[PDB]
């Protein structure tokens, strides 16, 4: 099912695990690098099903600074006391960005999955995903990443691993499929709130009425994603011209520098030929900017797939429902 390469597994997110995320959904940290915490479960039936995971609370007002690891191990000893071990099967985040994988935490979680191959990284975003498919995605830095290491180094060891060509997005693992039997008690609250106490269930049913009333679900999202296009994709094209300003453009008259002197003198050096071809700072594609390059131009792909299901099924409901 959700078996990975040589060791790593699927993740099963039980219904109280998303609630451990949505208790710190967006509260304390709007545009902050929110690390919603570390997901700890165990190697269980092909999918490391989550037990618990508490948000690792960085210096939370404006910026993000990783805390004392005294909290980490003392808290997950606090768990050891009446609950499961720190079986940290990854880390997870919100993080006011549907359809992204960050650069710094990409490196951090690759190094996480380097220490333990059997690890995944969950990204749950609320309806800020734009409604908007695939709110929860448990991404992992791939087993091609894992083979060719360390790690995806920029000026050297970039195209030198893009020769075999690492896969970049591979096994964005499935999330929640089975009646985990952490449910029967939740069904026992479900039936109670479906019964005589049907004020709160209908509160949430009614709550989505005003997420389309005043929010620019499409307009503000396609604006920020289009300004992600103009900045990222076009400076990507300037990178494409600049790696051409070096590999062939500059190289072309490095060749005309070599050739115009009859490729050296018989009796003596051959000083100029050896002195020339001064290799430009990009000698091989600059293919670590371009790694996250592909992954963030595909972040635009799953952000344009967002924009797809926004406009298509909204105007589906318009032309099917209104005609009265």
């Amino acid at each position: 099912g959700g078996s990975g390469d040589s060791a790593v597994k699927q993740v099963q997110i039980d219904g109280l695990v998303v609630l451990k995320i949505i208790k710190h959904y967006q509260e304390e940290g709007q545009g902050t690098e929110v690390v919603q915490g570390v997901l700890l479960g165990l190697v269980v039936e092909d999918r490391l099903e989550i037990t618990n995971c508490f948000p690792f609370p960085q210096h939370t007002e404006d910026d993000a600074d990783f805390d004392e690891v005294q909290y980490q191990m003392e808290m997950m000893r606090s768990l050891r006391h009446v609950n499961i071990d720190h079986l940290h099967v990854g880390w997870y985040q919100s993080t006011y960005y549907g359809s992204f994988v960050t650069r710094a935490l990409l490196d951090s979680q690759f190094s996480y999955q380097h220490a333990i191959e059997e690890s995944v990284v969950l990204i749950y975003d609320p309806i800020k995903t734009a409604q908007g498919s695939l709110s929860l995605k448990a991404y992992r830095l791939t087993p091609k990443l894992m083979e060719v290491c360390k790690e995806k180094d920029f000026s050297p060891e970039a195209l030198k691993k893009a020769n075999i060509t690492f896969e970049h997005m591979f096994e964005e693992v499935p999330i929640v499929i089975k009646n985990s039997h952490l449910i029967n008690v939740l069904m026992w609250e479900l039936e109670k709130k479906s019964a005589v106490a049907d004020k709160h269930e209908l509160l949430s049913l009614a709550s989505s009425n005003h997420l389309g009333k005043n929010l620019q679900l499409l307009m503000d999202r396609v604006d920020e994603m289009s300004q992600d296009i103009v900045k990222y994709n076009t400076y990507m094209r300037n990178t494409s011209k600049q790696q051409q300003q070096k590999h062939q453009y500059q190289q072309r008259r490095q060749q005309e520098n070599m050739q115009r002197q009859s490729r050296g003198e018989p009796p003596l050096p051959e000083e100029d030929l050896s002195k020339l071809f001064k290799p430009p700072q990009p000698p091989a594609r600059m293919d670590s900017l371009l790694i996250a390059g592909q992954i963030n131009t595909y972040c635009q792909n799953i952000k344009e797939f967002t924009a797809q299901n926004l406009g298509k099924l909204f105007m589906a409901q318009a032309l099917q429902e209104y005609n009265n």
Binding site: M219, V222, D223, S226, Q227, I229, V230, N233, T234, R237, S240, K241, Q244, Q245, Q248, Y249
Partner: protein, 186 residues
């Protein structure tokens, strides 16, 4: 201030590829990146606090702060023409502030007035019938005319249509780049 805060407040609503890179922004990034301002004291802020209202056109408010306390601080006295350089300035304030609602405040403006516009800002009807005519041909604005009646029906609709064109500010700067990609390749 009359070749930049007027010429280029047209393409500054999501059409950036005409920005002249030597202008007031030499100093406009300075006397705006200050946490506190009031009634200006220096030359440049006293040459700005009427400019900032020359964006909210106010013919009244902008004419009243190039002639505040400069006739001591060298504007009127020094330019060896006693009162006339202001009669020049006032005119290039009166006129260059009718060329503003034309370029800025035209969104829900469909039917507009061009007799009352002469009563508002007090320029000569022909010296307003000329530039209101110029507004269409010289600045290729989306507005129609039958000027036997002295009128300019707009029918502009560009507001949430220039947003998908503000996507073509960058959807061009995707497919304008593929034009430049294979120039280098071969």
């Amino acid at each position: 201030y009359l070749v930049s805060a007027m010429l280029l407040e047209i393409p500054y609503m999501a059409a950036h590829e005409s920005d002249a890179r030597r202008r007031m922004i030499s100093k406009q990034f300075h006397h705006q990146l200050r946490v506190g301002e009031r009634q200006p004291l220096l030359g440049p802020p006293e040459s700005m606090r009427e400019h900032v209202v020359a964006a909210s056109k106010a013919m009244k408010m902008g004419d009243w702060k190039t002639c505040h306390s400069f006739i001591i601080n060298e504007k009127m006295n020094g330019k060896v023409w006693d009162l006339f350089p202001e009669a020049d300035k006032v005119r290039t304030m009166l006129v260059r502030k009718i060329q503003e609602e034309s370029l800025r405040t035209y969104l829900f403006t469909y039917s507009s007035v061009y007799d009352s516009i002469s009563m508002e800002t007090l320029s000569d009807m022909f010296e307003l019938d000329l530039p209101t005519v110029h507004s269409i041909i010289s600045k290729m604005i989306i507005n129609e005319e039958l000027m036997a009646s002295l009128d300019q029906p707009t029918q502009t609709v560009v507001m949430h249509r220039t947003e998908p064109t503000a996507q073509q500010n960058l959807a061009l700067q995707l497919a304008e780049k593929l034009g430049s990609l294979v120039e280098n390749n071969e």
